[PDB]
From Swiss-Prot:
The NET domain mediates interaction with a number of chromatin proteins involved in transcription regulation (NSD3, JMJD6, CHD4, GLTSCR1 and ATAD5). The C-terminal (CTD) region mediates interaction and recruitment of CDK9 and CCNT1 subunits of the P-TEFb complex. It is also required for maintenance of higher-order chromatin structure. It comes from Homo sapiens (Human). The record marks N99 as: Acetylated histone binding. This is Bromodomain-containing protein 4. JQ1, a thieno-triazolo-1,4-diazepine derivative, and I-BET, a benzodiazepine derivative, have been tested on tumors with success. Treatment with GSK1210151A (I-BET151, a I-BET derivative) has strong effets on mixed lineage leukemia and promotes myeloid differentiation and leukemia stem-cell depletion. Coiled coil: none annotated. The gene is BRD4. Disulfide bonds: none annotated. Residues 17-123 form the Bromo domain. Signal peptide: none annotated.
Amino acid sequence: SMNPPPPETSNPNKPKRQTNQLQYLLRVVLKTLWKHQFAWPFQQPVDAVKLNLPDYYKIIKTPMDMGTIKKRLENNYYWNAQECIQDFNTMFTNCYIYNKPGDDIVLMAEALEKLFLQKINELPTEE
Ligand SMILES: CCOC(=O)N1CCS[C@H](c2cccs2)CC1
């Protein structure tokens, strides 16, 4: 079995900035979710080899994880906050697509997503 290459976290061809909203996404949003007791499955790309999930990347074609998001924020990969918000939402959606309601991993995603929604509700106006 083999894992795909991870999502890119650097691309010198891609225009970048550091907005107040992106700083909030790192300092408040990512930090809050990263320290949570349920963060660990989401802190790096899904290792379908180690987890013995050969169908994971057959089903999930747009993988995303908080390790990738963390590096994107720290490396100033994004142009705007919406790109990063979309990455978080992709991560949660992949979890709900692949897994079953009530699975431990889904309960973990739901807890992180609740905090995500609480923090992005107060995303500062641009700036
Ligand atoms: C981060 C998204 O991870 C996943 O969706 N998978 C698919 C099967 S659940 C498995 C785990 C269950 C409980 C702890 S880790 C993680 C990998």
